[PDB]
Amino acid sequence: NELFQDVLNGDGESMSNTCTAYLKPVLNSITLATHKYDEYFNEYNN
Amino acid sequence: SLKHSVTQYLEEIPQQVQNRLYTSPATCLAIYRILPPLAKFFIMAMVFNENEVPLLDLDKWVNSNGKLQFQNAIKSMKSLHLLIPNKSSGTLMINLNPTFKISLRNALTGGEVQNSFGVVVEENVVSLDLLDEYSANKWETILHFMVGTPLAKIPSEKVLNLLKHSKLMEEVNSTGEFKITNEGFQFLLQEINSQLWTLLLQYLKMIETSKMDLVDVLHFIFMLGALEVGKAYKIDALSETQRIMLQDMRDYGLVFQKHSNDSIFYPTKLALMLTSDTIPDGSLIVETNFKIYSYSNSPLQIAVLSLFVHLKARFVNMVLGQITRESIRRALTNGITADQIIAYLETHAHPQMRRLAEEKLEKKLELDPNCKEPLQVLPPTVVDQIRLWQLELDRVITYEGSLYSDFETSQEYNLLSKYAQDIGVLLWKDDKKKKFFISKEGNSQVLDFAKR
Amino acid sequence: PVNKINKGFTLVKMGFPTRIFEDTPTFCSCHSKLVYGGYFCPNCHSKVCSL
Amino acid sequence: ESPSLLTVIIEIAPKLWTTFDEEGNEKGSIIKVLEALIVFLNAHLAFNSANKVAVIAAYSQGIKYLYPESTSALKASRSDLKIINSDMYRRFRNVDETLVEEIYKLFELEKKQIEQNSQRSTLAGAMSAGLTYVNRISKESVTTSLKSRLLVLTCGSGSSKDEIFQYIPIMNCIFSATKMKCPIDVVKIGGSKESTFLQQTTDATNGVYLHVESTEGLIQYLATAMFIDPSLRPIIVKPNHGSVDFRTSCYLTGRVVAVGFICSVCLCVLSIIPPGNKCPACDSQFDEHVIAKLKRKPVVPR
Amino acid sequence: TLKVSNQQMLQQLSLVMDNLINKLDLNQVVPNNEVSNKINKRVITAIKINAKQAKHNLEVKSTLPI
Ligand SMILES: [Zn+2]
Ligand SMILES: [Zn+2]
Ligand SMILES: [Zn+2]
C-alpha cells in the first residue's frame, strides 16, 4: 500500500493503476492468507 | 502460376461482364474454388445471410498474424467484384454480389441451375482404354508437332493458326518451319494443367469475333471443369457458340465425341484435371562426362530431350544422350535459356542423384557447420558448362540507334545528353568523347528535338 | 509396474487451478515475471505459468 | 491451399430428439439438423475440389457410417430413391443421396428394433471411429498433405444429464486428436448450456464449441463458426465463448472438485477422504499416519 | 450440484420418415433475415470477446520505467 501511495503521489493516476494491476494477484493472495489466519484464529478463540 | 493467371484474367474481365458471368452456378463454383482460403471462408460465411455485413466483423474474425492474408483476400475479392462496398451511417458496409450469391446458394442447396452442370444419358464408354487414350493421343499429337518431331499426323489448322498467333511457336516461311521459343519451352516445363490453362487463356485472348460470346465461352470452360470423366452429356443444353467450341475442344482433346455433329459428347480426364492437380517416367541421370541416361519410354519426353541433348542410343527403359556444345547451342539459338535447361535437368533428376547429393550435403554439414550450401542434385561442372555456353552465345549484345557527335560546343551536347537521360532512351554518354547514344525507338524524340 | 510389497498407498492433496484471462499482464508467483495469462491456484489464488 | 477431411460425428438419438421436439414448439427438428448438415457438407466440398467428407451416426444401439456407405452395400448394389433432386451438382448429389439413404436405412433399422431401450450413449465410440477414419485416410495419403477436422453435432435437450462413463473415452479422443493435429468441433443443439467434456474437447484439441437452442438457422452457425478449415486455424480466431475450467467430478459425491485429493494408484478424484480408510474405485488400504497428516488442522496461537 | 413414451417416439419417428420421403427441400435452410442477424450478432460478440482475450498472450514489455 505504501508503494501504491508513493507511485500515486509521484506519477499521478496515469500509471499507479498499472502498478496496482501488476501487484493485484499477490496482494489478493496475501490478503486471503491473512483472512484464513483470522478465521482460524477466531474459530479457536470462540 | 495457375490460380494467379486465372485470377488475373478474371480481374481483367470488366465488371458487367463479371456480373453476367456470375449467372451460372458452375462458373460461380469454379471461381469460388479459385479464391484464397480466407476469401472462401468469408464468402461462405456471408452467403447464407441476406442482411448486411461490415468489414469490422471480418477484421475481428482474423487473428493478428493473418492480417496480411486478410488484406490479400479483401483486395482479391474487391478486384473480382465479389464485394460491393456501401458508405452509409459512417461504416463501410459490405454486400456479397447478388448474382454470385444466388448462383452459389443454388449450386449448394440444389434447385434452379438452368442445366449449368449438364444432363447425363447414362450410356458411357470406357475411361482408361478409350477416353484417356483419345485425350492422350490428341495431347501427344499437339506436343509432338509443337516440339517439331517428324509426324505422319499433324493437328488442325485452328490450333496451327492459334500457335502462330500466340507468343510461342515462332515461324518463318523463308525456311518454312516453326521454332520453339523461350516461353514455348517454359510451356513444356510446367504441369499440363497449367499448360491447358495458358492455352485456354491465350485462346480467350484471341477470340474477339462476334461468333464467340465470352461469357458463354467461360461458362463452357468452367462447366467442363465441373463435369466428370467416363459418362456422357447432351449438346442440346448448349448455345451454338458452345457447340462450335465443343467441336474446338474435341480438336484439342479436352472432350471426346464419337462422331462429328453428334448429340452426345464425352469429357475426358483433362477436363477434370483442368481444375486442380490429382521411379517416375522421364527421370534422368547426368554425369560429369556430360552423359545423360534418361529412363524414358515416352516419345514426347525423348523429343523434348532432343531439343538440347545429342541423343546417341535408345532402349525400352532409357535413352542414351550426351549434353554437347552444339546441342546446347541449338537450344540457345532456339532461345531456350540455360536457367530453364538447368531447371528441366533438376526437375527430371534421378532419385539416385538426389540421395548422393543428400550424402554430399550431410558430409558437408558434418565437416563445416558454419556455412550452409544448397542441395546440388546435378554436377556443378555440367551446370557451369551450360552457363558458360550461354555466356559464349551472349558474349556481345547489340542495340541499334543513333550517335550524335562532332559538337563544337560542349553545352549543347550536355543539353542533348541530359534530355536523352530524362526521356530514358540513353544508353551511353561522355563529354570526353562528346558522344551520347540512344535506342532506335528513342531516335525519333531526339530527332524532332534537334529539328525543332 | 510397482511391486506388491510396497504399501505407499496415500491420497495426494492437489488442486485444479483456474485458467485466468486478463488483458493486463501480472507478476507470476513462480518466476516473478510479467505474464498475461496464467493459472490461479484454488487454495491460495497465486498464479502459475505452466502446468 | 490444402484439402481436408471433414468427419461429422452426428448423434441421432430418437430419445434425445423426441425430448428436444417436446421441449421446443416445432416437431421433426432432425430434418432441419440433417438438411443444414447436408448444405454444410456441400459447402465443405465446394471449398476445395480434392477435400473429403465422412459422416458417422451414433444411434441408440451403436454407430453406423452414413457417407460413404458400407462396401458390402456397394458390392450388392442401386435403387436410387428421389429424395434429393437430380438436377443439382452431381459431385455433391451422390454424397447427399448416400447420406439420406443411410439415414433412412438407420431409422428403418431402429424402427424395427425400437423396443430395446438403452442407457448407453455411443457418441464416444462414434468419435473414436471418426478418429480411426481420420488416421486411415491420413495413412493412405492418396491426396498428399491432407488436413483433417472433426465436427460433432450432438443434442442434449435437457433430458440426459452428464454421463460419467463417457469421461475416459472422450479424454482418449482428445489425446489422439491432439497427436494427429485434428481439431474437434462440437455443436450442441439443446437446452443445457454447459457440456463440460465436449467443451474440454474443443478447448484442448483447438476446436470450436457452440451451444445452440433452436434448430432454425443452423446453416449460418455451420458456415460461419464451423467452416474453419485447418489451413486457416492459426489465422482465424474461434468464437468458443464460455471458457471451461478443466476440472473433474468426485468419485463418491459427484460434485465439481476444488482443491482435493486423488488416489496415488488408480488416480480417482475425491473431494473428501473416503470412509473405511480404503479407496472406493481402487480398493487400496490407506495409511492412517499420512491420512492423519492430511486431516490435521492449521495452526494459530490462542 | 420428462420420460418420452415409445408410442409418441414412434409417432415422431414416422413423422421424420414421411418428411424425408415426400420432399427434402434444402432451400429451407435459408434463414428469414432476422434470425440470421441475431445469429451473426451472437457469433460476432463471441468473436469480439475471444479476440479481446487472445489479442496478446522472456517476459513481455511494460509501461513502467525500469
Ligand atoms: Zn512464472
Ligand atoms: Zn497455491
Ligand atoms: Zn485407488
Q: What whole-number distance in Å separates Cα of residue D152 and Cα of residue D27?
A: 22
Rg (CA), chain C: 16
Shortest-distance ligand to the CA of residue D252: 3
Q: Is E35 on the interface with A (CB under 8 A)?
A: no
B177-179 and D62-67 beta bridge pairing: unpaired
The sign of the dihedral angle between the CA atoms of A20, A25, A27, A28 is: positive
Chain D contact partners (≥3 CB pairs within 8 A)? A, B, C, E
C13 touches D267 (CB < 8 A):
no
The sign of the dihedral angle between the CA atoms of C24, C29, C33, C37 is: negative
Burial group, residue B118, by CB count within 10 angstroms (0-12, 13-18, 19+): buried
Determine the length of chain B.
Answer: 452
The sign of the dihedral angle between the CA atoms of B202, B203, B205, B206 is: positive
Rounded alpha-carbon distances, angstroms, from residue C25 to B188, C21, D129 = 58, 10, 42
DSSP class per residue in B398-417 = ---EEEE---S-HHHHHHHH
Cell triple for D123: 457418441
Whether D248 is covered by a domain: the verdict is no
Burial group, residue B403, by CB count within 10 angstroms (0-12, 13-18, 19+): exposed
Residues of E in contact with B96 (CB under 8 A): none
Burial group, residue A24, by CB count within 10 angstroms (0-12, 13-18, 19+): middle
The sign of the dihedral angle between the CA atoms of D120, D122, D125, D127 is: negative
Residues of C in contact with A26 (CB under 8 A): 27, 29, 46
Shortest-distance ligand to the CA of residue C28: 1
**Which of E53, E58, E62, E63 has the most C C-beta neighbours within 10 Å, making it the best mutation to test the interface with C?**
E53
Residues of E in contact with A19 (CB under 8 A): 64
Q: What whole-number distance in Å separates Cα of residue D100 and Cα of residue E26?
A: 12
Domain tally for chain D?
A: 1
Helices B192-206 and B3-12 pack at an angle, to 10 degrees, of: 20
The sign of the dihedral angle between the CA atoms of B163, B164, B165, B170 is: positive
Cell triple for D167: 469421461
**To the nearest whole angstrom, how far is the Cα of A44 from the nearest Cα of chain E?**
31
Q: Amino acid identity, residue D76?
A: A
Whether D287 is covered by a domain: the verdict is no
Q: What whole-number distance in Å separates Cα of residue D194 and Cα of residue D256?
A: 13
Q: What whole-number distance in Å separates Cα of residue B345 and Cα of residue B336?
A: 13
**φ/ψ (deg, to 5) at D34:** -65, -40
Residues of D in contact with B65 (CB under 8 A): 234-235
> H or E segment at B25?
helix B25-34
Shortest-distance ligand to the CA of residue D283: 3
D147-154 and D184-189 beta bridge pairing: parallel
Q: What whole-number distance in Å separates Cα of residue D186 and Cα of residue B16?
A: 42
**Chain D residues with CB-CB distance to A under 8 A?**
297-298, 300-302
User: At which residue does the C-alpha cell 471418426 appear?
Assistant: D130
| Residue in E with minimal Cα distance to A16 | E64
Cell triple for E23: 420432399
Shortest-distance ligand to the CA of residue E59: 1
Q: Which of B197, B30, B198 is nearest to B104 (CA)?
A: B30
Whether D105 is covered by a domain: the verdict is yes
- Does D298 sit within 8 Å of A41, measured CB to CB? no
- Domain, as residue range, for D17: 4-226
Q: What whole-number distance in Å separates Cα of residue C22 and Cα of residue D242?
A: 14
| Residue in D with minimal Cα distance to E19 | D31
B170 DSSP assignment: E
Q: What whole-number distance in Å separates Cα of residue D66 and Cα of residue D95?
A: 9
For chain D, give the residues followed by a break (C–N over 2.5 Å). 77
- b/e per residue E12-35 (b: at least 16 CB within 10 A): bbeebeebbeeebebeebbbeeee
Whether D286 is covered by a domain: the verdict is no
Q: Is E62 on the interface with A (CB under 8 A)?
A: yes
| Residue in A with minimal Cα distance to C40 | A25
Burial group, residue B432, by CB count within 10 angstroms (0-12, 13-18, 19+): exposed
Q: What whole-number distance in Å separates Cα of residue B272 and Cα of residue B241?
A: 22
Q: What whole-number distance in Å separates Cα of residue E47 and Cα of residue E41?
A: 10
Beta bridge partners of B87: B92
Q: Which of B33, E53, B68, E36 is nearest to D224 (CA)?
A: E36
Q: Is D160 on the interface with C (CB under 8 A)?
A: no
Whether D295 is covered by a domain: the verdict is no
- For position D189, which CATH number holds? 3.40.50.410
Q: Which of B89, B73, B10 is nearest to B39 (CA)?
A: B73
Whether D270 is covered by a domain: the verdict is no
- Does D21 sit within 8 Å of E12, measured CB to CB? yes
Q: Amino acid identity, residue B101?
A: K
Rounded alpha-carbon distances, angstroms, from residue B121 to B235, B236, D89, D90, D232 = 11, 12, 15, 13, 41
Resolution, given in Å to one decimal, reads 3.0
B324 touches B330 (CB < 8 A):
no
Q: Is B47 on the interface with D (CB under 8 A)?
A: yes
Contact exists between A and B (3 or more beta carbon pairs < 8 Å) = no
Residues of C in contact with D263 (CB under 8 A): 9, 11
Q: What whole-number distance in Å separates Cα of residue D185 and Cα of residue D229?
A: 11
Residue D40 CA neighbour count, 13 Å, CB half: 27
Beta bridge partners of B171: B178
B44 touches D232 (CB < 8 A):
no
Contact exists between B and D (3 or more beta carbon pairs < 8 Å) = yes
Q: Amino acid identity, residue D268?
A: C
**Cα-to-centroid distance, A25 and ligand 2 (Å):** 12
D200 touches D20 (CB < 8 A):
no
**Cα-to-centroid distance, D268 and ligand 3 (Å):** 6
User: At which residue does the C-alpha cell 456422357 appear?
Assistant: B232
The sign of the dihedral angle between the CA atoms of B350, B356, B358, B361 is: negative
**Cα-to-centroid distance, A40 and ligand 2 (Å):** 18
Q: Which stretches within B95-131 are classed as H helix?
A: 98-109
Helices D29-47 and D14-23 pack at an angle, to 10 degrees, of: 110
Tally A–E CB contacts below 8 A: 8
Rounded alpha-carbon distances, angstroms, from residue D5 to B29, B365, D209, D237 = 19, 39, 19, 20
Q: What whole-number distance in Å separates Cα of residue B95 and Cα of residue B42?
A: 11
Q: What whole-number distance in Å separates Cα of residue B213 and Cα of residue B207?
A: 9
**To the nearest whole angstrom, how far is the Cα of E32 from the nearest Cα of chain A?**
46
Beta bridge partners of B320: B293, B313
Q: Which of C24, C25, C46 sits opposite A29 (nearest CB)?
A: C46
Determine the length of chain A.
Answer: 46
User: At which residue does the C-alpha cell 451438382 appear?
Assistant: D89
Q: What whole-number distance in Å separates Cα of residue E12 and Cα of residue D30?
A: 10
**Cα-to-centroid distance, D28 and ligand 2 (Å):** 51
C12 DSSP assignment: E
Contacts of the segment D163-170: beta carbons below 8 A, 24+ positions apart: D163/D121, D164/D249, D164/D254, D165/D120, D166/D121, D166/D123, D166/D124, D166/D197, D167/D197, D167/D248, D167/D249, D169/D124, D169/D125, D169/D127, D169/D128, D170/D124, D170/D127, D170/D197, D170/D198, D170/D200, D170/D201
Shortest-distance ligand to the CA of residue C33: 1
Beta bridge partners of B250: none
- Does E26 sit within 8 Å of B105, measured CB to CB? no
- Does E36 sit within 8 Å of B48, measured CB to CB? yes
Whether D241 is covered by a domain: the verdict is no
- Does B41 sit within 8 Å of D236, measured CB to CB? yes
Q: Which of B111, B20, D234 is nearest to E24 (CA)?
A: B111
**Cα-to-centroid distance, B360 and ligand 3 (Å):** 57
Question: B230: which residues sit within 8 A by CB, 6+ positions away?
Answer: B124, B125, B126, B127, B131, B266
Residue D121 CA neighbour count, 13 Å, CB half: 25
Largest pairwise CA distance in chain B: 88
**Cα-to-centroid distance, D264 and ligand 3 (Å):** 7
Cis peptide before D280 (omega within 30 of 0): no
Beta bridge partners of B267: B255
Whether D127 is covered by a domain: the verdict is yes
Question: D291: which residues sit within 8 A by CB, 6+ positions away?
Answer: C10, C11, D273, D277
For chain D, give the secondary structure using H, E and C. CCCEEEEEEECCCHHHHHHHHHHCCCCCHHHHHHHHHHHHHHHHHHHCCCCEEEEEEEECCEEEEEECCCHHHHHHCCCCCCCCCCCCCHHHHHHHHHHHHHHHHHHHHHHHCCCCCCCCCCHHHHHHHHHHHHHHHHHHCCCCCCEEEEEEEECCCCCCCCCHHHHHHHHHHHHHHHHCCCCEEEEEECCCCCCHHHHHHHHHHCCCEEEECCCCCHHHHHHHCCCCCCCCCCCECCCCCCCCCCCCECCCCCCECCCEEEECCCCCEECCCCHHHECCCCCCECCHHHHHHHHCCCCCCC
Q: Which stretches within B313-442 are classed as H helix?
A: 325-333, 338-347, 351-367, 380-393, 410-423
Q: Is E21 on the interface with D (CB under 8 A)?
A: yes
Q: What whole-number distance in Å separates Cα of residue B4 and Cα of residue B149?
A: 32
Experimental method: cryo-EM
Q: Is C40 on the interface with A (CB under 8 A)?
A: yes
Q: Which of C26, C40, C47 sits opposite A21 (nearest CB)?
A: C26
Q: Is D216 on the interface with E (CB under 8 A)?
A: yes
**φ/ψ (deg, to 5) at E25:** -85, 95
CA B1 to chain centre: 6
Cell triple for D90: 452431381
Residues of D in contact with B275 (CB under 8 A): 49
Cell triple for B8: 488475373
Q: Amino acid identity, residue B62?
A: V
**Cα-to-centroid distance, A36 and ligand 2 (Å):** 13
Residues of C in contact with D286 (CB under 8 A): 9-11
Cell triple for D253: 459425491
CA D36 to chain centre: 17
CA B409 to chain centre: 54
